[PDB]
Symmetry: C3
C-alpha cells in the first residue's frame, strides 16, 4: 500500500518498498510545502527533462541520500560530471528495478539544462510510466498534447499526473483531451498555473474531465492518495 | 479585415490590429522580394525553430521595432542574451495575447541555433496555430509528415502554410497527406526550392491536393490573401 | 541483387551498385566481427543520431573512402568541421541519390554528440527508409515505440531493422507492436544484447512477431540476406 504525494509544480513523491521522487523542484519552489530536510530517505530520483524547475535539487538530494537518478542519457551524463549516481535510459525504454518497472514515455517539450548562462543539451523531454506492485502511475512531465499518449490506453493506468498550466504546457482543454486518450482510472492535475492560486482553473478541469467520464482527484501541494 | 502576406521561404506577415511576422528570414533570402526596410511596424515575431533561415533577422527586427519574440524557452533564452524582449512558450502550449491566441504545435525536425560556428541547442521545433478574430492560421514551420497534425483537424483551420521543398522537409506527396490530416479550408505551399526552379512542384501539389478536396492557393513571394 | 549484412549493434551494410553503411560503430564495438580494414569500399554513410555507438567511426571511414555522410543538419555540421563530406537532410525529408532514395523517418530518442566530455546538440534522432531498385529497407535507428511508425505501413517495407534491447530502446513487447504497425515482409532484430546472451529475448521476439504474420530473420553479427 504505497503513498503518493504531490508537492507542487510537478513534484511527485512515491513512498513504498523504496522511496521515489519525480522532478524534485523543492528549493526555490514557492508552491512546495516542504523543505529538502522535510523529505524522507530517497532511493531513486526521476527527472523528466532538463529544465530547472524539474531537474530541481536532484544533485543535492542524490548526494545526501546516495540516491540514483533515473533519466535520459544526456541528462545522466551532465549529472555524472557532478558526481551523481545515474541509471541512464531513453524514450520508450523500460527497466525492472528492485522497487518495480520504470518506462520513459514520449513528450513534446524542450530539455535544455541551464548551467550558468549556457544552455546545455539534455536530450528530449519525457514522462514516466511506473509499475509498482501491479499499480501503474503515469507522470506526463512537461508536455503538450500528443497522439503518443494513446499508446498508454492499453496500460489501464491507475493514476495519471497531467500538467494543466498552459503556455509552457497543455491548458485545461488539451489536458482533458489527453485524459480521454489515456483513459486512466484517476487523473491528478498538476503544474496547474505554476502558481499558488488556481482554484478556478483546476476546478474547471475537474468539471470538464469528469463530464468525459474520468475521475479527477484534486491534490493540493502536500496532499496524498493511496494505492 | 486581415492581410496575410507570404514573403518566400517560410516568411509570413500578418497585418491586422497588430502586426506579426513568422520566421523572418529577410536579408540573405534571395527569394524574398522586400528588404528589412520594406517591412511595416512589427509588434510580435514568431520563431518556429533555431535554424538560420527561420530565426533570420529576428534580433534586428525586434530591436528596431521594440517587438516581442514568441518562441520556445531555449530560443528565447538565446535571444534574451542578445538583449531581445521575449515571451517564452513550449510545444502544445498556448497563450492569449492582445491581438489573439497563439499555440505552439509539434513538428518533426531539428532546432539548432548557429552562433558563429557553434551549434547551440534551440529546444525542439514547432509550428504555430494563430487564432485572430475567430480565424485560424496554421504555420507548420519546418516539419516532416507527423500524425500529430491530425490533432488540428477539429480546429477547422482556415489557412494552412505547409512546406513542400523536400530533403529538409516534406515533399509534395507527403504534404498532400498532411493537408488531408489537417483538413484546412485553404492550403498554401511554402519553403519550396529557391531560385524559382520548382513551379512544376507547386502546380503538382495544387493538382494533387485539390483532388483530395482541399482548396490550394498558390502565393508567389509578395502575394497576399484576406481573412 | 543486394547483400544486406548486419554487423552487430545497429550496424547495417548494404552492398549493391553502391555501398552504404548505417550507424558504423565498428572499432569500439565488441560484438562487431570485422574491423574497419574488413569493410569494402564505402560510398555513403548514414547516421541516425549523434550517440557514439551509432555515429561510430563515421569520420574515419568517410575520409579513407572519400564517402559522403547522410544525416540531419546538426550532425552534418559537426562532421563538416572535421573535414567530412556531407549531405544534410531532416526528419521526413527525402532525396534521390544515384543508388536510390533515402528518407529520414521520425524516432523518439536523444541525439547528443559526445566530443571530449562536452555534450553537443546533434538535432533530433531519426530512422532511414531506403528505396533501392524497388526494394525498401527500414532502419529504425534508436527509438521507442511511436505512432509515427504507422505512417510506414503504406510503404510496404521489405525488410525492417528494429531495436529490441530495452532500457535505451524498445523491448520485445513494444518491438512486436512496432512490427504490427509497420507490417514489413521481413523483420530483423538488432541492438538486442548486444552481448551474445541474452539470446532468449531474440527467440521470444521471433516467436511472438511471427504469430502476427511477420517473418523474422535472426541475423548474427556477420550474417546477411539477399534482397
Ligand atoms: Ni519544462
Ligand atoms: Ni529547418
Ligand atoms: Ni542512442
Amino acid at each position: 500500500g504505497m503513498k503518493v504525494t504531490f508537492l507542487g509544480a510537478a513534484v511527485v513523491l512515491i513512498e513504498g518498498k523504496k522511496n521515489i521522487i519525480i522532478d524534485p523542484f523543492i528549493s526555490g519552489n514557492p508552491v512546495c510545502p516542504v523543505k529538502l530536510e522535510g523529505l524522507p530517505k530517497i532511493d531513486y530520483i526521476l527527472v523528466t527533462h532538463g529544465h530547472g524547475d524539474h531537474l530541481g535539487d536532484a544533485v543535492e538530494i542524490a548526494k545526501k541520500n546516495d540516491a540514483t537518478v533515473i533519466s535520459n542519457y544526456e541528462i545522466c551524463h551532465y549529472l555524472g560530471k557532478k558526481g551523481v549516481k545515474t541509471h541512464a535510459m531513453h524514450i520508450g525504454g523500460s527497466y525492472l528495478f528492485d522497487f518495480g518497472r520504470v518506462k520513459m514515455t514520449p513528450a513534446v517539450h524542450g530539455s535544455g539544462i541551464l548551467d550558468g548562462d549556457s544552455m546545455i543539451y539534455g536530450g528530449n523531454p519525457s514522462g514516466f510510466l511506473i509499475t509498482i506492485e501491479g499499480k501503474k502511475i503515469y507522470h506526463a512531465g512537461d508536455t503538450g498534447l500528443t497522439r503518443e499518449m494513446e499508446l498508454l490506453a492499453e496500460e489501464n493506468v491507475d493514476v495519471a499526473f497531467l500538467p494543466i498550466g498552459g503556455n509552457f504546457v497543455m491548458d485545461v482543454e488539451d489536458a482533458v483531451r489527453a485524459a480521454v486518450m489515456i483513459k486512466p482510472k484517476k487523473v491528478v492535475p498538476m503544474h496547474y498555473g505554476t502558481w499558488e492560486l488556481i482554484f478556478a482553473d483546476v476546478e474547471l478541469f475537474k468539471k470538464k474531465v469528469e463530464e468525459k467520464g474520468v475521475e479527477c482527484v484534486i491534490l493540493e501541494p502536500g496532499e496524498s492518495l493511496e494505492l
